[PDB]
Amino acid sequence: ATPSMMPQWSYMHISGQDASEYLSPGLVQFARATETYFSLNNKFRNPTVAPTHDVTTDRSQRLTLRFIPVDREDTAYSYKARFTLAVGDNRVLDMASTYF
């Protein structure tokens, strides 16, 4: 279920609200007032959670693909290679992560 449905994880601040909110407003104003010479900013932990919907697939799909030269031709001083780069549907490829 949702973590916020689980009570304990909210009680121990594993998941829930940040420390800017569940504190009574007076103490928050106090802490913001005296940050330069008496800091309370590290006496409370703020939870962080990661998204779980529509980020990562579940089908079978590889992370790294390796393509073979469809054609190669050679000479005395320089040689030429030619590949067929195939990008299947429902994917996007950034050319910054390709190398020979």
**Alpha carbons 22 and 46: distance in angstroms, whole number:** 10
Q: Which of 17, 30, 32, 35 binds other proteins (CB under 8 A)?
A: 30
Q: Of 30 and 32, which CB lies nearer to other proteins in the complex structure?
A: 30
State the minimum distance, in angstroms, from the CB of residue 32 to other proteins: 14
Dist CA 75 CA 80 (whole Å)? 9
Contact track, other proteins, 62-91, x by CB under 8 A: xxxxxxxx--x------x-x-x-x----xx
Q: Does 41 bind other proteins (CB under 8 A)?
A: no
| Residue whose C-alpha is closest to residue 14's, from 51, 50, 49 | 49
14 binds other proteins (CB under 8 A): yes
Helix (H) or strand (E) holding 80: strand 80-82
